[PDB]
Write a protein that binds this ligand. Structure first.
Ligand SMILES: NC(=O)[C@@H]1[C@H](Nc2nc(Nc3cccc(C(=O)N4CCCC4)c3)nc3ccsc23)[C@H]2C=C[C@@H]1C2
Length: 283
């Protein structure tokens, strides 16, 4: 990695301006380590995470580094460096031009809807990123659409490794709308990551967020039960902001989603099967 001065990062982010990009400032959004800022260093656009308890935050800071030191891959975000010298710890990444899957699915800041063809490639890439992490004996613990970033060619890039673990069952963490039953109870298994990817795939098919309090069902994973009981079909939930979806491949992706969302962890497919199933979709 390169090493950055805190005051260099403070300088190139307009003294950490927290108002959004469109109004004038540098806040791109908010994640696991709070606010992420846009900046420019070494003739290169960069995302800066400012890691603002303080003791528990440093453990997550080192985890992001220890994971991103060894684990370099096509479908994982890239850490360019870090800063420890100033008041708070910081992490610098290569800026992903198209932001998060979540924001593009909701068309935040007026971006055009993602096509079905685009959505499939993203599904595949995300699975490939998750596959690399499981091959290298890592569990993410926070797979969700906010943590899948999209590059200049809409390549899926998995991010946020603060809550990741290397390789069990008293500190339960993650985002409850995406977490499996056993993870909510406190189990640390790579099978929990497959469940969450199940929900992420339902977001891709439907363009609906995992949770919405102004909606029935409030949790997106409950549509699986609506479809199995034949009250509604998957075709009734397909995102209407696409002009290029077809039934077969959508049903194919929903089948992968449905198998991922099995409540019994040992009956879910492993990531290599999910990856194989999603390749058979496009082929
Ligand atoms: N899991 C996350 O940390 C998410 C995201 N983090 C990042 N975002 C971006 N890119 C980004 C973000 C927002 C806007 C735009 C943008 O310019 N456009 C123009 C066309 C449409 C979008 C680009 N790059 C990186 C690189 C390393 S982390 C990261 C942020 C949003 C939600 C959180 C914080």
């Amino acid at each position: 990695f390169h090493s950055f001065s805190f005051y260099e990062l403070k300088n190139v982010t307009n003294n950490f301006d927290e108002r959004p990009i469109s109004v004038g400032g540098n806040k791109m959004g908010e994640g696991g380590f709070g606010v992420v800022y846009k900046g420019y260093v070494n003739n290169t656009t960069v995302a800066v995470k400012k890691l603002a308890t303080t003791e528990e935050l440093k453990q997550q800071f080192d985890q992001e580094i220890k994971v991103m030191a060894k684990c370099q891959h096509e479908n994982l975000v890239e850490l360019l460096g870090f800063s420890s010298d100033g008041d708070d710890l910081c992490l610098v990444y290569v800026y992903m031009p198209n932001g998060s899957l979540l924001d593009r699915l909701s068309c935040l800041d007026g971006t055009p809807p993602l096509s079905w063809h685009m959505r499939c490639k993203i599904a595949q890439g995300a699975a490939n990123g998750i596959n690399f992490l499981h091959e290298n004996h890592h569990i993410h613990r926070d797979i969700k659409s906010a943590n899948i970033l999209l590059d200049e060619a809409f390549t899926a890039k998995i991010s946020d490794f603060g809550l990741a673990r290397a390789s069990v069952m008293s500190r339960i963490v993650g985002t409850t709308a995406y977490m499996a039953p056993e993870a909510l109870r406190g189990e640390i298994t790579p099978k929990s990551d497959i469940y969450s990817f199940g929900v992420v795939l339902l977001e891709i098919i439907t363009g609906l967020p995992a949770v919405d309090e102004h909606r029935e069902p409030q949790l997106l994973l409950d549509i699986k039960e609506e479809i199995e009981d034949e009250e509604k079909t998957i075709e009734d939930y397909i995102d209407k902001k696409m002009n290029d979806a077809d039934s077969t491949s959508v049903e194919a992706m929903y089948s992968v989603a449905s198998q991922c969302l099995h409540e019994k962890k040992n009956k879910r497919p492993d990531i290599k099967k999910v990856q194989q199933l999603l390749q058979e979709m496009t082929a």
